[PDB]
Amino acid sequence: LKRPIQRIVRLSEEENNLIKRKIEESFFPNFQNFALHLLIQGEIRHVDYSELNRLTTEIHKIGININQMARLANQFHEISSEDIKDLTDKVQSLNALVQSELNKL
Amino acid sequence: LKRPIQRIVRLSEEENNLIKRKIEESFFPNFQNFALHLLIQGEIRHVDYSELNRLTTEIHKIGININQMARLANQFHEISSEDIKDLTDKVQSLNALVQSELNKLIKRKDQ
């Protein structure tokens, strides 16, 4: 025999009905030929979001500044109106760093 | 019995050896889980959202710190109640951007 190896795929009733539609929408007449082609041609794709790593790292160091401001405000229980608008500026600068490093992509 | 239907695929030894190498290259343990996904979806895509969640988690942390600050600032009459508002708006205006603009990225990656 040309193909003596037999592999089984087990299916639910709905999964089987999906398979039937895919066969009909395919170029192939029957399951054997549909499945053979797709198992051989289907290529696994790996996808990650490492292109954001540069942006994540620049946000992070803004983070550590805002973080130490917060630790200090909490240990001295004081905050000034100058600290508030200074925060606001750091916030609108994060808004800039985000649109910028994301258009770059 | 969750899966009471079986379909059979016949292979040559060389086609079967090719499929084994593919199953090893995927995140699926065995032929069942590999075929089921590939025959119904038509592709296998392993997506790692790790770096994207590291981004949104950092933005979340900054938001916590800012809220701690704004809240405290309510204890001081010299700090305008409507200048704390102007800091809290710009944090939600940044969350908005981060979320939408990152969905535009997840679409340009699911293609």
Automatic annotation (TrEMBL), chain A:
<keyword id="KW-0614">Plasmid</keyword>
<dbReference type="InterPro" id="IPR008687">
    <property type="entry name" value="MobC"/>
</dbReference>
<dbReference type="Pfam" id="PF05713">
    <property type="entry name" value="MobC"/>
</dbReference>
<protein>
    <submittedName>
        <fullName>PcfF</fullName>
    </submittedName>
</protein>
<feature type="domain" description="Bacterial mobilisation">
    <location>
        <begin position="58"/>
        <end position="99"/>
    </location>
</feature>
